[PDB]
RNA sequence: GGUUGCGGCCAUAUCUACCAGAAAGCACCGUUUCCCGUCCGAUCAACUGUAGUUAAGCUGGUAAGAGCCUGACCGAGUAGUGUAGUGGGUGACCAUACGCGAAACUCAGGUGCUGCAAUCU
């Protein structure tokens, strides 16, 4: 579904010798809470000696975008598995939210490298609104002062199967 | 607490090399008339409590000791693996989901514990 940024705070189960464990937290983009808690145990199993059975999740929360109607430059660092091996890349994309850029990121990763969600780890989603922090020319071109372009060859959708005049693609 | 006899678990007890051991206790031990097998009273058998021997046995301590034992979010949730998909990949194989989960390695700690009957300044 629509990716939602969840904060997931969990810990290892409290034993007698070690009450109050170290309370690790992650921000993971997921469709829903069930996948959020699942993705949490998957990564926390990767960085620590803990699995779902031996730990508990102490807080699950949604993080909302601070201002969902300002467009920003998002610096995305990702590792993914291709058929041959593993690679780390830094991509970047315009958006208004962290989540929709991550939705965009998974679409681009699937399209350009045939990477399924199973294969992708989102290392760090970073926002910058200051130029010269933007490295990719496919994003720099929308930051030129006084941007303006046409939308040539406008194709208009037809509700009916027949029309009674050749179409016009003017704009 | 030492020691002896009988033990239990059977190295946290073994192994190497040094250092120490008061009283209690093997025996430094001494002897061959007697029971007792032989080349050998060395082992084994029997007889004594002697110069007074702790030299050895034994016990303890030491050693960035070997070994052994215990533990660890140490490696490592790794390897492996139960279940699942009309997942990926030509394949070889791999990723993912729900579970189980090592061994090496590394780091620490530990040098037997203990039952019964006696005996001991």
Swiss-Prot record:
There is a cross-link at residues 124, 130, 148 (Glycyl lysine isopeptide (Lys-Gly) (interchain with G-Cter in ubiquitin)). The modification Phosphoserine is found at residue 31. Component of the ribosome, a large ribonucleoprotein complex responsible for the synthesis of proteins in the cell. The small ribosomal subunit (SSU) binds messenger RNAs (mRNAs) and translates the encoded message by selecting cognate aminoacyl-transfer RNA (tRNA) molecules. The large subunit (LSU) contains the ribosomal catalytic site termed the peptidyl transferase center (PTC), which catalyzes the formation of peptide bonds, thereby polymerizing the amino acids delivered by tRNAs into a polypeptide chain. The lineage of its organism: Eukaryota, Fungi, Dikarya, Ascomycota, Saccharomycotina. Pfam families: Ribosomal_L18A. InterPro entries: Ribosomal_eL20, Ribosomal_eL20_dom, Ribosomal_eL20_eukaryotes. Transmembrane segments: none annotated. GO terms for molecular function: structural constituent of ribosome. GO terms for biological process: cytoplasmic translation. Disulfide bonds: none annotated. Belongs to the eukaryotic ribosomal protein eL20 family. Keywords: Cytoplasm, Isopeptide bond, Phosphoprotein, Ribonucleoprotein, Ribosomal protein, Ubl conjugation. Gene3D superfamilies: 3.10.20.10. Component of the large ribosomal subunit (LSU). Mature yeast ribosomes consist of a small (40S) and a large (60S) subunit. The 40S small subunit contains 1 molecule of ribosomal RNA (18S rRNA) and 33 different proteins (encoded by 57 genes). The large 60S subunit contains 3 rRNA molecules (25S, 5.8S and 5S rRNA) and 46 different proteins (encoded by 81 genes). eL20 forms multiple interactions with RNA and proteins in the central protuberance, connecting components of core functional centers that are located far apart. This is Large ribosomal subunit protein eL20A. Present with 54300 molecules/cell in log phase SD medium. There are 2 genes for eL20 in yeast. It is found in: Cytoplasm. It comes from the Eukaryota. Its main location: cytoplasm. GO terms for cellular component: cytosol; cytosolic large ribosomal subunit.
């Amino acid at each position: 579904a629509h990716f939602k940024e969840y904060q997931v705070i969990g810990r290892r189960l409290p034993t007698e010798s070690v009450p109050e464990p170290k309370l690790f937290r992650m921000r993971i983009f997921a469709s829903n809470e069930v996948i959020a808690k699942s993705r949490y145990w998957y990564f926390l199993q990767k960085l620590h000696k803990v699995k779902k059975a031996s730990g508990e999740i102490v807080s699950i929360n949604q993080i909302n975008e601070a201002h969902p109607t300002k467009v920003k430059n998002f610096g995305v660092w990702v590792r993914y598995d291709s058929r041959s091996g593993t690679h780390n890349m830094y991509k970047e994309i315009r958006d208004v939210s962290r989540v929709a850029a991550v939705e965009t990121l998974y679409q681009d990763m699937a399209a350009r490298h045939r990477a399924r969600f199973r294969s992708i780890h989102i290392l760090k989603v970073a926002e910058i609104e200051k130029t010269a922090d933007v490295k990719r020319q496919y994003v720099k071109q929308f930051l030129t002062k006084d941007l303006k372009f046409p939308l040539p060859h406008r194709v208009q959708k037809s509700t009916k199967t027949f029309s009674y005049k050749r179409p016009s693609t003017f704009y």
